[PDB]
């Protein structure tokens, strides 16, 4: 219904991400800082040494199997339009190494999808039972990059003491992204037991293995208006289900009060 923010990203993304609410009186959420790239709030010393980048020597568009960067994930998984190959492993995704500033190739080579940012039209909107969510304003073919999970990089130890644990994402001495205070559009993506996106670890401008960047891609074709969602995983629900249970929705739901109660009856 009513458009209450023309762009929650304040021009930082390639495209605007509007906010609407046709459900209740909750105003546009502003209790966080929108950022389009990950931030630091303590000394992390991400390894940005250009000489530590593995890089290719391609003089074409990096579409051949000889591209070193592709070979670092056995092959490049992007088709000619920037979408994940049908055969991509959606259960145990590989780590993707995109081309970078040490590579001989051009900025528009075929192995630069995530670093090129958001292209699909998305919307922050009020759901019926799960607060704010994100939905698609267009059809989205399977394998399409949607957005990155961006926030504040923190240590595992800091993550263990964070008072609000509703926006934490484990990268993998493990580090985490907390999108509570600083985050992007991904902070509003809800959990679905029937998910339509999946997270993939990606390297771009650096290859510091502590700090993969988290890219969401569509795991199937997505219809206009559909809510986006991923499976947050059991390392979220084992802790959170004491406080609330899952409000999808789905006949496949594994985390509803009913599901949990049923399994509990385990004699």
């Amino acid at each position: 219904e009513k458009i209450i923010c023309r762009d929650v990203a304040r021009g930082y993304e390639n495209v605007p991400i509007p906010c609407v609410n046709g459900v209740d009186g909750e105003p546009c959420p502003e209790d966080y800082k929108y950022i389009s790239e990950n931030c630091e709030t303590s000394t992390m010393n991400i390894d940005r040494n250009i000489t530590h980048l593995q890089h290719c020597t391609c003089v074409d568009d990096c579409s051949s199997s000889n591209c070193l960067c592709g070979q670092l994930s056995i092959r490049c998984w992007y088709d000619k339009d920037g979408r994940l190959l049908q055969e991509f492993n959606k259960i145990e995704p590989p780590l993707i190494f995109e081309c970078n500033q040490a590579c001989s190739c051009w900025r528009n080579c075929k192995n630069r999808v995530v670093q090129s940012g958001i292209k699909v039209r998305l919307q922050l909107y009020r759901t019926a039972k799960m607060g704010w969510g994100v939905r698609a304003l267009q059809t989205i073919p399977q394998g399409t990059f949607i957005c990155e999970y961006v926030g504040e990089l923190i240590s595992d130890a800091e993550a263990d003491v964070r008072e609000d644990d509703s926006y934490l994402f484990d990268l993998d001495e493990v580090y985490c992204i907390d999108a509570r205070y600083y985050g992007n559009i991904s902070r509003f993506i809800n959990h679905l037991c029937d998910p339509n996106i999946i997270p993939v670890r990606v390297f771009m401008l650096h290859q510091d293995l502590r700090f993969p960047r988290i890219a969401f891609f569509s795991s199937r074709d997505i219809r206009t208006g559909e809510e986006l969602g991923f499976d947050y995983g059991d390392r979220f629900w084992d802790i959170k289900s004491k406080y609330f249970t899952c409000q999808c929705g789905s006949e496949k739901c594994k985390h509803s009060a009913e599901a949990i109660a049923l399994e509990q009856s385990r004699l």
Partner: peptide
């Protein structure tokens, strides 16, 4: 297992 909830792959 940790004290706080985290989404993960």
């Amino acid at each position: 297992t940790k004290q706080t909830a985290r989404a993960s792959t």
